[PDB]
Design a protein around this ligand. Structure first.
Ligand SMILES: C[C@H]1O[C@H](O)[C@H](O)[C@@H](O)[C@@H]1N[C@H]1C=C(CO)[C@@H](O[C@H]2O[C@H](CO)[C@@H](O[C@H]3O[C@H](CO)[C@@H](O[C@H]4O[C@H](CO)[C@@H](O)[C@H](O)[C@H]4O)[C@H](O)[C@H]3O)[C@H](O)[C@H]2O)[C@H](O)[C@H]1O
Ligand SMILES: *[C@H]1O[C@H](CO)[C@@H](O)[C@H](O)[C@H]1NC(C)=O
Ligand SMILES: O=N[O-]
Ligand SMILES: [Ca+2]
Length: 496
């Protein structure tokens, strides 16, 4: 469950947050496959509650009604068509599995669901599954509100309602079977793995029992014996009873300390600076690299809806974001997930964004198609960070240097740092308020390399900055603290 099951080479997955299945299918064929992306995190594919107050917020998809593959992203056939077309071009699909709970206990009963299934939170009836009052933790939860009240009590965190979401009795074989039935349907369809939503709220052992029910990946696309990739969403920072290491027996875990600390370092908060990143990784209290799913921001915290808080960097801080994603894609630590979002009417007051609920670009509730502009950027308000040159090229950079060790580190004791990956790649950063001009050991073979941040290698020539590596591997780099992108990256495949 620790291997992402990507084709040989592919080292990253992209979160196409709220994209429709038909759009992801096309993206697999037109961009993801040729650019070297490993897979796609799709939003929950199961039927959810249609919430109109506020109007169709993104979070309504973490409020399950049934396991029918029927949502604003598409129906069961469109989903299947997506997995098939993506697998055929070597791009995997990872499902965001919302299995800890059903919808909010106070949501009104009826057919206000993405597939019209009837459900009654109050009587705890979800006939489309079916689930009844016997399948929820009402009796088990010991808090006065029935909701989670204190995170210092690991039991309550697992047995009570996360912000009121009806909590499934995951210890019951009936519930484990219903969930495995849903996950096996997706696996047999071609899905390569899952994001286990709210894993902190599930007992490591209940997750284990459910995983024991899962099949091996579809043998038409995957090697025999392939176990689905599993990454547990567990927000574990400082002091609290639950540790993400408690889930290592089930697969990887989201390392929320990663984006949080990379954000404070890049923002230079509390005296932090890039020179400190020399021991980036476990040295920072992070989980072991082979158990980490890393990212700069995720759909939640990019809205201030999660771990990391204010330090989290997003597409809104484009300049620094590209830098952060660049360091992440160049560093060997963990398995990288690139965020891809949509622009929303972010409006702050008294410090909080009152529009952080806004769902994806839509027309009367119907999610808008992703349109590709002539310059390869997206329209319809989709940000498509994965299409940004500096990010897509670092995605390729990661593939090129895969397996190569972290080496040849340099820092000026402040914010000008650089490092290489074996003799396959080299990257340099300048985040100080002054220019950086110096000759560094790159560990790369002599020659002329195209800097993939400022440009591309095309038709045997460079469109941007060019770096010359001498016979001893040394090369001169010059970065103005005013440069559009204050960092340079060169690798074996951008060599002329
Ligand atoms: C949110 C995080 O809280 C901790 O930090 C956990 O440790 C962590 O695991 C979790 N993050 C994961 C899990 C959930 C939960 O479903 C998702 O939260 C996402 O989906 C939730 C459910 O729709 C959202 O809740 C929001 O919507 C719910 C209903 O739609 C509301 O229920 C409330 O109103 C409903 C009616 O309107 C009622 O029926 C319900 O009983 C009542 O509790 C919550 O009060 C509200 O905050 C949440 O705002 C969003 O971020 C995240 O995307 C996912 O990353
Ligand atoms: C790269 O471009 C230059 C012109 O900018 C041209 O002279 C050169 O021959 C090109 N290289 C190749 C390999 O086509
Ligand atoms: O999986 N990211 O929360
Ligand atoms: Ca639970």
């Amino acid at each position: 469950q620790y291997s992402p099951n990507t084709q040989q080479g592919r080292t990253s997955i992209v979160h196409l947050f709220e994209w429709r299945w038909v759009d992801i299918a096309l993206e697999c064929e037109r961009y993801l496959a040729p650019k070297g992306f490993g897979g796609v995190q799709v939003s929950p594919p199961n039927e959810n509650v249609a919430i109109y107050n506020p109007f169709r917020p993104w979070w309504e998809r973490y409020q399950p009604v049934s396991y029918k593959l029927c949502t604003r992203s598409g129906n069961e056939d469109e989903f299947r068509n997506m997995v098939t077309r993506c697998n055929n071009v070597g791009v995997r699909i990872y499902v965001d599995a919302v299995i800890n709970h059903m919808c909010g206990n106070a949501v009104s009963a009826g057919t206000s669901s993405t597939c019209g299934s009837y459900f009654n939170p109050g009587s705890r009836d979800f006939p489309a599954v079916p689930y009844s009052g016997w399948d929820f933790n009402d009796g088990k939860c010991k808090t006065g509100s029935g909701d989670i009240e204190n995170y210092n009590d690991a039991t309550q965190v697992r047995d009570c309602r996360l912000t009121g979401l009806l909590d499934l009795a995951l210890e019951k074989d009936y519930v484990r079977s219903k969930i495995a039935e849903y996950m096996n349907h997706l696996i047999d369809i071609g899905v390569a793995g899952f994001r286990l939503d709210a894993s902190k709220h599930m007992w490591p052992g209940d997750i284990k029992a459910i995983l024991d029910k899962l099949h091996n990946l579809n043998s038409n696309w995957f090697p025999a014996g392939s176990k689905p990739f599993i990454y547990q969403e567990v927000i574990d920072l400082g002091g609290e009873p639950i540790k993400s290491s408690d889930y290592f027996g089930n697969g990887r875990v989201t390392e929320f300390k990663y984006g949080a600390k990379l954000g404070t370092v890049i923002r230079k908060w509390n005296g932090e600076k890039m020179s400190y990143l020399k021991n980036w990784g476990e040295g920072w209290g992070f989980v072991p690299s082979d158990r980490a799913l890393v990212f700069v921001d995720n759909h939640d915290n990019q809205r201030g809806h999660g771990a990391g808080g204010a330090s989290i960097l997003t597409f809104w801080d484009a300049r620094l974001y590209k830098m952060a994603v660049g360091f992440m894609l160049a560093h060997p630590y963990g398995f990288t997930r690139v965020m891809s979002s949509y622009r929303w009417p972010r409006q702050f007051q008294n410090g909080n964004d009152v529009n952080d609920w806004v769902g994806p670009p839509n027309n009367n509730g119907v999610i808008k198609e992703v349109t590709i502009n002539p310059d390869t950027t997206c329209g319809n308000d989709w940000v498509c960070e994965h299409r940004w040159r500096q990010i897509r090229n670092m995605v390729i950079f990661r593939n090129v240097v895969d397996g190569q060790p972290f080496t040849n580190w340099y820092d000026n004791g402040s914010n000008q740092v650089a490092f290489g990956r074996g003799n396959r790649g080299f990257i340099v950063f300048n985040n100080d308020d002054w220019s950086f001009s110096l000759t560094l050991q790159t560990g790369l073979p002599a020659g002329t390399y195209c800097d993939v941040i400022s440009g591309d290698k095309i038709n045997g020539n460079c469109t941007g900055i060019k770096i010359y590596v001498s016979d001893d591997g040394k090369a001169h780099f010059s970065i103005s603290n005013s440069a559009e992108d204050p960092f340079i990256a060169i690798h074996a495949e951008s060599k002329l």
